[PDB]
Short mmCIF file of C-alpha atoms in Angstrom, two decimals:
data_model
loop_
_atom_site.label_atom_id
_atom_site.label_comp_id
_atom_site.label_asym_id
_atom_site.label_seq_id
_atom_site.Cartn_x
_atom_site.Cartn_y
_atom_site.Cartn_z
CA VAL A 1 -5.42 14.11 -21.26
CA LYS A 2 -6.93 14.60 -18.01
CA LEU A 3 -9.40 12.03 -16.65
CA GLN A 4 -11.01 13.24 -13.71
CA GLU A 5 -12.39 10.94 -10.63
CA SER A 6 -12.93 11.90 -7.06
CA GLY A 7 -10.04 10.92 -4.71
CA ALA A 8 -12.25 9.33 -1.90
CA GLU A 9 -15.89 7.58 -1.50
CA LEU A 10 -16.99 6.27 2.10
CA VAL A 11 -20.05 3.97 1.79
CA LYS A 12 -21.92 1.77 4.31
CA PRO A 13 -22.01 -1.92 3.59
CA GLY A 14 -25.13 -3.14 1.77
CA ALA A 15 -25.30 0.09 -0.02
CA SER A 16 -24.27 1.10 -3.55
CA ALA A 17 -22.17 3.90 -4.87
CA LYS A 18 -21.85 5.42 -8.41
CA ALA A 19 -18.26 6.96 -9.02
CA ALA A 20 -17.97 9.30 -12.03
CA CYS A 21 -14.78 9.65 -14.24
CA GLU A 22 -15.08 13.08 -16.49
CA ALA A 23 -12.66 13.00 -19.62
CA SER A 24 -11.40 16.24 -21.17
CA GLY A 25 -8.53 17.29 -24.10
CA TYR A 26 -9.59 14.38 -26.62
CA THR A 27 -12.74 13.13 -28.44
CA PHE A 28 -14.54 11.01 -26.20
CA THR A 29 -16.52 8.69 -28.18
CA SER A 30 -13.32 7.58 -29.81
CA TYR A 31 -12.11 5.42 -27.21
CA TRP A 32 -13.06 2.78 -24.85
CA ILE A 33 -12.88 3.11 -21.01
CA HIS A 34 -11.99 0.39 -18.83
CA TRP A 35 -12.36 0.15 -14.80
CA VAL A 36 -9.63 -1.57 -12.88
CA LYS A 37 -9.51 -2.54 -9.34
CA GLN A 38 -6.67 -2.55 -6.62
CA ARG A 39 -7.18 -3.76 -3.32
CA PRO A 40 -5.10 -2.23 -0.82
CA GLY A 41 -1.41 -3.70 -1.08
CA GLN A 42 -2.47 -6.33 -3.75
CA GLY A 43 -2.29 -6.27 -7.84
CA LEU A 44 -4.77 -5.14 -10.79
CA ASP A 45 -7.93 -6.98 -11.70
CA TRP A 46 -9.93 -5.80 -14.47
CA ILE A 47 -13.88 -5.12 -13.89
CA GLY A 48 -15.02 -4.43 -17.32
CA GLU A 49 -14.86 -2.23 -20.49
CA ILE A 50 -17.43 0.24 -22.12
CA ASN A 51 -17.64 1.25 -25.71
CA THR A 52 -18.24 5.26 -25.22
CA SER A 53 -19.96 5.66 -28.58
CA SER A 54 -22.70 2.91 -28.39
CA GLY A 55 -22.71 2.01 -24.81
CA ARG A 56 -21.93 -1.85 -24.93
CA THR A 57 -20.39 -3.27 -22.16
CA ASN A 58 -18.05 -6.46 -21.55
CA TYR A 59 -17.68 -7.61 -17.96
CA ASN A 60 -14.78 -9.95 -15.84
CA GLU A 61 -17.25 -12.60 -14.60
CA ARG A 62 -16.17 -12.20 -11.20
CA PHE A 63 -17.71 -8.69 -11.30
CA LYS A 64 -20.96 -9.60 -13.23
CA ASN A 65 -23.93 -8.51 -10.67
CA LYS A 66 -21.21 -6.33 -8.56
CA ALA A 67 -20.49 -3.29 -11.37
CA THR A 68 -22.56 -1.83 -13.83
CA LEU A 69 -20.95 0.76 -16.28
CA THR A 70 -22.53 3.20 -18.06
CA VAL A 71 -21.45 6.38 -20.17
CA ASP A 72 -23.08 9.81 -20.95
CA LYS A 73 -21.34 11.22 -24.20
CA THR A 74 -23.17 14.62 -23.77
CA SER A 75 -20.87 15.38 -20.71
CA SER A 76 -17.87 13.07 -21.65
CA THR A 77 -18.48 11.12 -18.38
CA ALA A 78 -17.95 6.99 -17.34
CA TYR A 79 -19.37 5.87 -14.41
CA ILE A 80 -19.07 2.66 -12.51
CA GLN A 81 -21.65 1.51 -9.82
CA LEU A 82 -21.07 -1.04 -7.56
CA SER A 83 -24.19 -2.94 -5.48
CA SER A 84 -24.59 -4.82 -2.30
CA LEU A 85 -21.16 -3.56 -0.70
CA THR A 86 -18.97 -5.46 1.37
CA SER A 87 -15.57 -4.80 3.27
CA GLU A 88 -14.01 -6.82 0.34
CA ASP A 89 -15.26 -4.09 -2.06
CA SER A 90 -12.73 -1.65 -0.25
CA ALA A 91 -10.14 -0.90 -3.17
CA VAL A 92 -8.85 2.00 -5.42
CA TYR A 93 -11.28 1.97 -8.45
CA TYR A 94 -9.00 3.13 -11.64
CA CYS A 95 -10.83 4.53 -15.01
CA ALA A 96 -8.31 3.98 -17.94
CA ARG A 97 -8.65 4.92 -21.27
CA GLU A 98 -8.16 2.52 -24.19
CA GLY A 99 -5.91 3.77 -26.63
CA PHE A 100 -5.10 2.77 -30.33
CA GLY A 101 -2.07 0.86 -29.15
CA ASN A 102 -3.57 -2.53 -29.34
CA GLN A 103 -6.19 -1.95 -26.60
CA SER A 104 -3.09 -0.84 -24.21
CA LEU A 105 -4.06 1.64 -21.64
CA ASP A 106 -2.77 5.09 -22.17
CA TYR A 107 -4.21 7.36 -19.85
CA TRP A 108 -5.15 6.83 -16.29
CA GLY A 109 -7.45 8.72 -13.65
CA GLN A 110 -5.75 9.07 -10.06
CA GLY A 111 -8.15 6.68 -8.79
CA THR A 112 -11.23 6.69 -6.35
CA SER A 113 -10.50 5.11 -3.03
CA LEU A 114 -13.28 3.28 -2.00
CA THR A 115 -13.87 1.87 1.96
CA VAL A 116 -16.85 0.09 2.69
CA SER A 117 -17.42 0.45 6.76
CA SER A 118 -20.39 1.29 9.20
CA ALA A 119 -18.05 3.58 11.26
CA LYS A 120 -18.64 7.17 12.49
CA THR A 121 -16.20 9.54 12.33
CA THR A 122 -14.28 9.19 15.95
CA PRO A 123 -11.24 10.99 16.89
CA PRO A 124 -8.02 9.59 17.97
CA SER A 125 -6.52 8.77 21.17
CA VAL A 126 -3.02 9.95 21.39
CA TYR A 127 -0.71 8.06 23.71
CA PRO A 128 2.79 8.85 24.32
CA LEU A 129 5.41 5.75 24.06
CA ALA A 130 8.50 6.70 26.63
CA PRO A 131 11.10 3.86 27.26
CA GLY A 132 10.90 2.39 30.68
CA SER A 133 23.80 8.23 22.09
CA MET A 134 20.41 7.90 20.39
CA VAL A 135 17.06 7.50 22.10
CA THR A 136 14.04 6.78 20.24
CA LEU A 137 10.27 7.83 21.42
CA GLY A 138 7.03 7.16 19.73
CA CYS A 139 3.24 8.06 19.44
CA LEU A 140 0.59 5.42 19.24
CA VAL A 141 -2.55 6.89 17.50
CA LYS A 142 -5.58 4.73 17.91
CA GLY A 143 -9.20 4.14 17.46
CA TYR A 144 -9.93 6.87 14.66
CA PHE A 145 -11.72 6.93 11.48
CA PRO A 146 -11.61 7.45 8.61
CA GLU A 147 -7.98 8.27 7.58
CA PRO A 148 -6.04 10.08 7.13
CA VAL A 149 -3.86 11.39 10.41
CA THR A 150 -0.94 13.29 9.80
CA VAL A 151 1.58 12.96 12.64
CA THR A 152 4.60 15.63 12.99
CA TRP A 153 7.00 15.84 15.54
CA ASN A 154 7.73 19.39 17.12
CA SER A 155 5.60 20.67 14.58
CA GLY A 156 7.74 19.94 11.93
CA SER A 157 11.23 20.91 13.09
CA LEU A 158 11.93 16.97 13.99
CA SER A 159 11.70 15.56 10.29
CA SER A 160 14.64 13.63 10.08
CA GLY A 161 14.73 9.91 11.76
CA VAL A 162 10.83 9.98 11.69
CA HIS A 163 8.99 6.87 10.65
CA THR A 164 5.49 7.02 10.45
CA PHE A 165 3.70 3.77 9.86
CA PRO A 166 0.76 3.08 7.42
CA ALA A 167 -3.00 2.83 9.43
CA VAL A 168 -3.84 -0.94 10.23
CA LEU A 169 -7.58 -1.39 10.74
CA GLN A 170 -8.04 -2.52 14.49
CA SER A 171 -12.04 -3.18 15.01
CA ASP A 172 -13.52 -1.02 12.22
CA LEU A 173 -11.28 1.66 13.52
CA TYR A 174 -7.68 2.59 12.46
CA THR A 175 -4.36 2.71 14.49
CA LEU A 176 -1.02 3.76 13.62
CA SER A 177 2.20 4.46 15.37
CA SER A 178 5.13 7.04 14.70
CA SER A 179 8.68 6.68 16.00
CA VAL A 180 11.36 9.57 16.46
CA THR A 181 15.05 8.98 17.07
CA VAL A 182 16.91 12.12 18.56
CA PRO A 183 20.46 12.48 20.29
CA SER A 184 19.84 11.22 24.00
CA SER A 185 21.15 14.61 25.70
CA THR A 186 18.58 16.37 23.59
CA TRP A 187 15.59 14.26 25.35
CA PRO A 188 14.63 14.69 28.27
CA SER A 189 15.80 18.43 28.88
CA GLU A 190 14.31 19.62 25.37
CA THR A 191 10.77 18.81 24.79
CA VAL A 192 9.49 16.30 22.20
CA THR A 193 5.92 16.95 21.05
CA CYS A 194 4.26 14.52 18.95
CA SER A 195 1.38 16.78 16.65
CA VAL A 196 -1.06 14.69 15.48
CA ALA A 197 -4.05 16.21 13.30
CA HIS A 198 -7.22 14.38 12.21
CA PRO A 199 -9.19 16.79 10.22
CA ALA A 200 -12.43 14.84 9.42
CA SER A 201 -13.09 15.59 13.17
CA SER A 202 -11.62 18.86 13.21
CA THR A 203 -9.23 17.62 15.86
CA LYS A 204 -5.45 18.58 16.84
CA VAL A 205 -3.90 17.12 19.78
CA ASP A 206 -0.14 17.84 20.71
CA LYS A 207 1.29 15.26 23.19
CA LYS A 208 4.58 15.80 25.01
CA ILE A 209 6.69 12.82 25.69
CA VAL A 210 7.67 12.36 29.45
CA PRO A 211 10.08 10.14 31.06
CA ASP B 1 -8.56 -17.43 -18.00
CA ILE B 2 -5.32 -16.79 -19.05
CA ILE B 3 -3.24 -16.72 -16.38
CA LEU B 4 0.01 -14.43 -16.23
CA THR B 5 2.62 -15.49 -14.17
CA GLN B 6 5.36 -13.01 -13.05
CA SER B 7 8.17 -14.78 -11.21
CA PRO B 8 9.53 -13.56 -8.96
CA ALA B 9 7.33 -11.48 -7.34
CA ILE B 10 9.93 -9.42 -5.73
CA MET B 11 13.09 -8.75 -7.11
CA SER B 12 16.28 -6.92 -5.96
CA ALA B 13 19.00 -5.09 -7.77
CA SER B 14 21.98 -2.91 -7.39
CA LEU B 15 22.12 0.39 -9.16
CA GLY B 16 24.08 -0.12 -12.65
CA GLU B 17 22.71 -3.74 -12.98
CA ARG B 18 20.99 -4.99 -15.87
CA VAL B 19 17.56 -6.50 -14.88
CA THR B 20 15.01 -8.61 -16.50
CA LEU B 21 11.24 -9.05 -15.56
CA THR B 22 9.74 -12.23 -16.91
CA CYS B 23 5.74 -12.59 -17.78
CA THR B 24 4.65 -16.29 -18.55
CA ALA B 25 1.33 -17.06 -20.08
CA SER B 26 -0.61 -20.28 -19.64
CA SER B 27 -1.84 -20.47 -23.23
CA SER B 28 0.02 -18.67 -26.24
CA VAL B 29 -0.68 -14.71 -26.40
CA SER B 30 -0.10 -13.02 -29.60
CA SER B 31 2.65 -10.45 -29.23
CA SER B 32 0.62 -7.67 -30.44
CA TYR B 33 -1.93 -7.84 -27.58
CA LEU B 34 0.77 -8.29 -24.72
CA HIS B 35 1.88 -4.99 -22.62
CA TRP B 36 3.37 -3.71 -19.51
CA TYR B 37 2.99 -1.14 -16.98
CA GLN B 38 4.75 0.48 -14.21
CA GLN B 39 3.19 1.48 -10.71
CA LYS B 40 4.88 3.67 -7.75
CA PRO B 41 3.11 3.42 -4.50
CA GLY B 42 0.30 6.03 -4.11
CA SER B 43 0.14 6.67 -7.65
CA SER B 44 -1.79 5.07 -11.11
CA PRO B 45 -0.23 2.95 -13.31
CA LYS B 46 1.11 3.92 -16.49
CA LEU B 47 2.06 2.39 -19.71
CA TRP B 48 5.28 1.40 -19.89
CA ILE B 49 5.58 -0.88 -23.08
CA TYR B 50 2.82 -2.24 -25.64
CA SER B 51 2.54 -4.90 -28.24
CA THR B 52 5.93 -6.53 -26.69
CA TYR B 53 8.43 -4.15 -27.82
CA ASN B 54 7.47 -0.81 -28.07
CA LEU B 55 8.48 1.90 -25.51
CA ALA B 56 5.55 4.22 -24.45
CA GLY B 57 5.37 8.22 -24.36
CA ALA B 58 8.45 9.39 -22.14
CA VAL B 59 10.04 5.61 -21.23
CA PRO B 60 13.88 6.06 -21.23
CA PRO B 61 15.75 3.66 -23.96
CA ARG B 62 17.63 1.72 -20.94
CA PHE B 63 14.04 -0.28 -21.23
CA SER B 64 13.36 -3.03 -23.87
CA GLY B 65 10.81 -5.80 -23.91
CA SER B 66 10.80 -8.77 -26.20
CA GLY B 67 8.69 -12.19 -26.52
CA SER B 68 6.32 -14.39 -27.87
CA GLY B 69 3.98 -17.05 -27.23
CA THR B 70 4.19 -17.97 -23.41
CA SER B 71 7.35 -16.12 -22.99
CA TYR B 72 7.68 -12.43 -22.43
CA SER B 73 10.12 -10.02 -20.89
CA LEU B 74 11.04 -6.54 -20.01
CA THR B 75 14.66 -5.86 -19.63
CA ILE B 76 16.43 -2.63 -18.04
CA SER B 77 20.00 -2.45 -19.21
CA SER B 78 22.01 -0.75 -16.20
CA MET B 79 19.31 -0.11 -13.15
CA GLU B 80 18.33 3.40 -11.88
CA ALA B 81 16.63 4.35 -8.67
CA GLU B 82 13.68 5.99 -10.68
CA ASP B 83 13.35 2.39 -12.22
CA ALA B 84 12.38 0.72 -8.50
CA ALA B 85 8.66 0.20 -8.76
CA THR B 86 5.95 -2.76 -9.38
CA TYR B 87 5.77 -3.67 -13.14
CA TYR B 88 2.53 -5.62 -14.45
CA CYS B 89 2.12 -7.55 -17.61
CA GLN B 90 -1.66 -7.59 -19.26
CA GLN B 91 -2.90 -9.55 -21.97
CA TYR B 92 -5.95 -8.89 -24.90
CA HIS B 93 -5.40 -11.76 -26.54
CA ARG B 94 -9.00 -13.36 -25.33
CA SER B 95 -11.27 -11.91 -22.75
CA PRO B 96 -11.42 -11.95 -19.86
CA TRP B 97 -8.41 -9.45 -20.20
CA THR B 98 -5.86 -10.07 -17.51
CA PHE B 99 -2.81 -8.82 -15.63
CA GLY B 100 -0.11 -10.78 -13.67
CA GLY B 101 0.47 -10.28 -10.11
CA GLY B 102 3.28 -8.06 -10.74
CA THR B 103 7.07 -7.89 -10.09
CA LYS B 104 8.08 -5.33 -7.36
CA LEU B 105 11.63 -4.40 -8.04
CA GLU B 106 13.47 -2.71 -4.98
CA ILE B 107 17.09 -1.43 -4.71
CA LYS B 108 19.71 -3.82 -3.29
CA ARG B 109 21.88 -2.19 -0.64
CA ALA B 110 24.04 -3.31 1.61
CA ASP B 111 22.63 -5.67 4.88
CA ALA B 112 21.67 -3.81 8.10
CA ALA B 113 20.32 -4.91 11.62
CA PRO B 114 17.38 -3.45 12.92
CA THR B 115 17.24 -0.86 15.93
CA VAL B 116 14.54 -2.41 18.22
CA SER B 117 12.92 -0.32 20.88
CA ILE B 118 10.05 -1.41 23.04
CA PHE B 119 7.43 0.47 24.84
CA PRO B 120 5.14 -0.35 27.76
CA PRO B 121 1.44 0.92 27.86
CA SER B 122 1.19 4.50 28.41
CA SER B 123 -0.67 5.57 31.73
CA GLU B 124 -3.52 7.48 29.28
CA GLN B 125 -3.96 4.42 27.75
CA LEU B 126 -4.82 2.15 30.91
CA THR B 127 -7.42 4.76 32.22
CA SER B 128 -9.57 3.25 29.17
CA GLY B 129 -8.60 -0.29 29.95
CA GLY B 130 -6.65 -0.97 26.78
CA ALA B 131 -2.98 -1.80 27.00
CA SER B 132 -0.86 -1.65 23.71
CA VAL B 133 2.68 -2.76 23.69
CA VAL B 134 4.86 -1.38 21.06
CA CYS B 135 7.76 -2.40 19.38
CA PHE B 136 9.67 -0.69 16.74
CA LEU B 137 12.13 -2.52 14.31
CA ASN B 138 13.59 0.28 12.25
CA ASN B 139 16.26 1.08 9.07
CA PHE B 140 17.11 -2.81 7.98
CA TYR B 141 17.80 -4.34 5.11
CA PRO B 142 16.59 -7.05 3.82
CA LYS B 143 12.88 -6.44 4.16
CA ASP B 144 12.35 -10.01 5.48
CA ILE B 145 12.02 -10.17 9.28
CA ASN B 146 10.55 -12.25 12.27
CA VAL B 147 8.92 -10.63 15.33
CA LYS B 148 8.20 -12.67 17.96
CA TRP B 149 6.11 -11.60 21.55
CA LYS B 150 6.79 -13.15 25.04
CA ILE B 151 4.66 -12.43 27.79
CA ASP B 152 6.33 -13.82 30.85
CA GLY B 153 8.43 -16.24 28.70
CA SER B 154 5.95 -17.67 26.63
CA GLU B 155 4.78 -16.76 22.83
CA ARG B 156 1.76 -14.89 22.18
CA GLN B 157 0.38 -14.64 18.83
CA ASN B 158 -3.28 -13.24 19.79
CA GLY B 159 -3.62 -9.57 19.11
CA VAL B 160 -0.53 -8.73 17.35
CA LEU B 161 -0.62 -6.33 14.44
CA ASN B 162 2.16 -5.25 12.30
CA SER B 163 2.98 -2.71 9.66
CA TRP B 164 6.02 -1.88 7.31
CA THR B 165 7.37 1.07 5.62
CA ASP B 166 7.87 1.39 1.78
CA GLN B 167 11.58 1.15 1.02
CA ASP B 168 13.01 4.00 2.02
CA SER B 169 13.93 6.78 -0.94
CA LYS B 170 16.83 8.03 0.77
CA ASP B 171 18.98 5.13 2.14
CA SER B 172 16.78 2.09 0.99
CA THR B 173 16.38 0.45 4.55
CA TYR B 174 12.81 -0.63 5.64
CA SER B 175 11.15 -0.56 8.96
CA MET B 176 8.40 -2.14 10.53
CA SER B 177 6.14 -1.45 13.75
CA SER B 178 4.76 -4.37 15.86
CA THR B 179 1.99 -3.74 18.46
CA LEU B 180 0.52 -6.36 21.03
CA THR B 181 -2.66 -5.21 22.09
CA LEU B 182 -4.23 -6.84 25.32
CA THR B 183 -7.10 -5.71 28.04
CA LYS B 184 -6.07 -3.80 31.05
CA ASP B 185 -6.34 -6.69 33.29
CA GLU B 186 -4.96 -9.08 31.01
CA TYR B 187 -1.70 -6.55 30.95
CA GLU B 188 -1.61 -6.66 34.94
CA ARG B 189 -1.73 -10.42 35.14
CA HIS B 190 1.74 -10.70 33.85
CA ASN B 191 5.26 -9.00 34.54
CA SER B 192 7.74 -9.87 31.46
CA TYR B 193 7.12 -8.29 28.06
CA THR B 194 9.36 -9.14 25.37
CA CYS B 195 9.87 -8.26 21.50
CA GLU B 196 12.25 -10.62 19.97
CA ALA B 197 13.54 -9.69 16.39
CA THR B 198 15.21 -12.56 14.01
CA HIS B 199 16.78 -11.18 10.70
CA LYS B 200 19.51 -12.66 8.56
CA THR B 201 22.26 -10.01 10.02
CA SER B 202 22.71 -12.18 13.24
CA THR B 203 21.58 -15.63 14.18
CA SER B 204 20.67 -15.04 17.66
CA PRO B 205 17.43 -12.56 18.08
CA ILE B 206 17.74 -9.10 19.11
CA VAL B 207 15.74 -9.13 22.37
CA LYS B 208 14.04 -6.09 23.99
CA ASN B 209 12.12 -6.18 27.15
CA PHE B 210 10.79 -4.24 30.02
CA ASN B 211 8.89 -5.52 33.40
CA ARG B 212 6.04 -3.52 34.65
CA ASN B 213 6.96 -2.97 38.11
#
C-alpha cells in the first residue's frame, strides 16, 4: 500500500541527488525494495536491491559506482543516491516493493522524474502558425525550461481536434507545437487564440492566429 | 546476463482477437521466478502475472500465462481496449535481475492517410534570427511514416526534429509533428519549402509547399 516518491527533481550535471521513497501501510522490514530506471520512451532497467531489515545491497554492475541504496527503518524510507550525473542519467526512477510472490514487484511508487541539465528557467517564445471545409492552425512553443507547458485553444472551448505534441530538447531548451483543426467558415471571422502557460517562470502568453 | 527477448517489440490487434506475447530467455529460467508487468504511458508498471501463470490482484481472467525453460507467454483470449499497453517479462533465476525490452500492444483499426499541413516561419520568430518550418501529419494509421524536407527541390536532413502522439484513445489514429529549424539568413537564401509525407495508404507522397514570396 502507498510508496511515496517525489515526482520531479532537477539537478546540474556533475552533481549528486538523493531521492527518498517513503513506505506506509505495511511492515517495512518484511519486504525488500528495488529501484528501477526507465529512460524517456525506453524499457525498464533494474538498478539494485536493498534488504530493508539488515541494509545489505546487490547492484546491477552497470550502476555500481553510479547508485548507492540505503534504508532508514525508523522512518520507513528507502533512498537512492546517484553520483557524477550526466544527461544519460535523465530517467524516471521507480522504487518498488519485492513481494512474497517469488521476488515479484507487487507495489510501485509513481516514480521520480530526474532531469540532468545546466539550463535556467527561461520562459517560452510563442509563435503563431498561420497558413500561407476544415483549416488547420498551430502554435510553436519554443525555447523554454523546464517542462511542462500547457497549451489550450480559446481557453479550452477548442478542445476537440487539437493535437499537442510532446516536447523535444532543442539545445538544452524545450520545444513543442500544438495544432487545431476548425471549420473554415469559423477562421478568420471568429478568433482562434493559442493560450500557453509556463508555471515555472509564472508566465501566460495568449497569441491569436491572424491570416 | 540472462537476456530476455520479446518479439515482436510492437503488435497490433483488433478488439475481440486472441493475442499472444512471447518472452524468450537465453538460458533456462525456473518458471517460479518469471514475471510479467503491464505499463500504460505516464503510469508505473503493475504486476500482471507472477511465477508464469498466476494472475495478480485485479487482473481479469481473459489473461493467462504459461511456459518453462526458454519459452514463456502471456495470452489474451479476446482483446479489449483496456489491454492496449506495454508488457514486460522479468527473471529472478540468476542475478542480475533483468526485464525484457517489452512488447507494446496497440489496437488495429482501418488504415488512414495523414492530413498534412505546412506552416512558414512566423514574422515574430524572424525578428530573433531563427526560422522554423512546421509540418503537421495528423490522424493516420498505421504509425509507420516517412517525412522528407526539400528546400528549393533538394532534400535537407540537418535541423529536423519530430514528435509523435500516442495512439489516440478515441479513434486509434496517430499524429506527428516535423519541424525544420534554420537560421534566418539561411531561410532567406532559398524560396521553395516542401514537406513530403510517405505512408502505406498511397504510393505517391502527400506533398505540401509554400514559397516565401
